[PDB]
Write a protein that binds this DNA or RNA. Sequence first.
DNA 1: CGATCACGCAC
DNA 2: CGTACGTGATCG
Length: 580
Amino acid sequence: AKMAFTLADRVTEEMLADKAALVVEVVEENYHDAPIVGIAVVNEHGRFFLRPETALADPQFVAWLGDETKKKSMFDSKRAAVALKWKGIELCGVSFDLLLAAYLLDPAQGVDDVAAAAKMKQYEAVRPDEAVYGKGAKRAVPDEPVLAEHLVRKAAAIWELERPFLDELRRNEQDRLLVELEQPLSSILAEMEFAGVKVDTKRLEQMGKELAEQLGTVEQRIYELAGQEFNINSPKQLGVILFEKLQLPVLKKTKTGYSTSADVLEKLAPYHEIVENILHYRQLGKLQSTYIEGLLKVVRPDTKKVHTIFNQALTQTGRLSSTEPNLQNIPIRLEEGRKIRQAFVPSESDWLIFAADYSQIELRVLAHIAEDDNLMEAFRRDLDIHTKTAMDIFQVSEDEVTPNMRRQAKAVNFGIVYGISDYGLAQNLNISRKEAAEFIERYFESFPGVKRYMENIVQEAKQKGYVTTLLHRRRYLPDITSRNFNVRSFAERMAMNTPIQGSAADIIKKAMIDLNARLKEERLQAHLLLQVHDELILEAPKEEMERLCRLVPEVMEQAVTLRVPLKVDYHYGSTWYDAK
DNA sequence: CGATCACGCAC
DNA sequence: CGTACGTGATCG
Ligand SMILES: OC[C@H]1O[C@@](CO)(O[C@H]2O[C@H](CO)[C@@H](O)[C@H](O)[C@H]2O)[C@@H](O)[C@@H]1O
Ligand SMILES: OC[C@H]1O[C@@](CO)(O[C@H]2O[C@H](CO)[C@@H](O)[C@H](O)[C@H]2O)[C@@H](O)[C@@H]1O
Ligand SMILES: [Mg+2]
């Protein structure tokens, strides 16, 4: 059953053909400055394994890697490209990435190794990575014969599966989505991750100290008000204090005990002074554990940068996610947590942080896809969309919209985008199902095009088996035909929400590609650092701000043409916090 | 010692 | 009511 290959001791010309499947193996999950443990090449001339110390010191091999006219097919080329950037080696000419291809064909399969992708086309002559390397404490690179066979089998699978994957993408009208959107984006994400974001660790450490002080003060107040010391971070020890010793009302349960989620606590606050303190303690503790201690844990001590990894092949809607650290969930709503962003600073002297965000991109996308006359007109007038929604559903003039009315209309707008449900809206606004249902009815009366869209997209999902986004991303929804109400209803909300969230993802991905091309044409030093779903964060010399103020919003606004304008706001400053 | 829960942070 | 990730506590 074994697969034949040459275990090479040196690089030869036949390993440098102008088309090959290439494996540059990095086993560490976080590939930043990580070891390359082996290399495999499969091409018209045969199958080869190379030790990295050999290949990466070979000028002909390094030149071949960097030659855009020598085409490579890979799985997770970003991992290889970043590991190689840390070694000062450029990887070019990647014309097919099997991870991205599998992800576009069906994000729900959770493909995260070559074996998983291969199994989609009944190809099973390759082992799962976890079977070869193990996981956790037991993880390890195996001896060379085992490692080499595995890497060659992966390269061989890629070599075989490129054509059938590309053919299916073409049938789905997704080939341009792979080749013109996701693959070029992967190179841009590699650059962003490698550049990293500079952290002011002294500032973080100062914050940590002050937080520790306040945590102590609140911890003691809590013990004083409880008349006893306990582990506040145990939802179970806390449940006893709250609902037994102090007799607070049980407004909600969890399947293992009493709920102490913030929504429940907020309702209990009027009964006892301890509750406000538990909330404050939780807020501070979140900042301390996750955003100070957690961040400091992953800052590289030499450069004081953090280098996130953007998972490009995970979310079911086409968004990116971010890990180690997650730079897509840094606090902003509450001023206390917002100050964390003061610690993210430009990487060079006299540079600044520039941040540009789409204004209401999801509702603008909804206006476009639903062709709702009222919603399109609202955005053509650049109205405050929550005030407008309040005017319509509560039937009042702009003057007559109160803050509470705008607040409830805002929640309705979220619900509509998420996949509206009377129960979920009711939970969010703390009102009755019947009341939430009345709001939803008034909304559909004011935006009948949106109502028609929500009905039609659920029927389309049922008919075709999937829904699609602007640039032809797809999500299969098998549960749409379930005879279980709750299962089916969740699938219906995904049918409604995915073309909205996913088309917004497509637009900002295209914007990133267009922006990098413009930055290069203009030879600006400015470069992307982060994407947070509907916003792009850059750093640049202070002397480039004026040019960026014009260039970045324009590129983002013009990335696609919709039936309504796109609008981008922007800010810049000496830290991420100040880019407001 | 990995897997799970409950919770809270972003958009 | 949609999409994510990290944490401390607990589970087994
Ligand atoms: O390299 C990213 C790419 O690798 C995958 C596995 O194929 O995820 C791995 O890499 C991560 C980043 O360090 C981890 O978060 C993840 O646990 C790990 O399996 C893909 O999911 C991802 O696109
Ligand atoms: O009465 C129609 C109304 O119900 C929805 C669910 O909110 O869909 C239901 O009715 C459809 C048939 O008309 C079914 O295909 C569907 O499976 C069922 O849940 C809405 O789509 C809708 O317009
Ligand atoms: Mg915004």
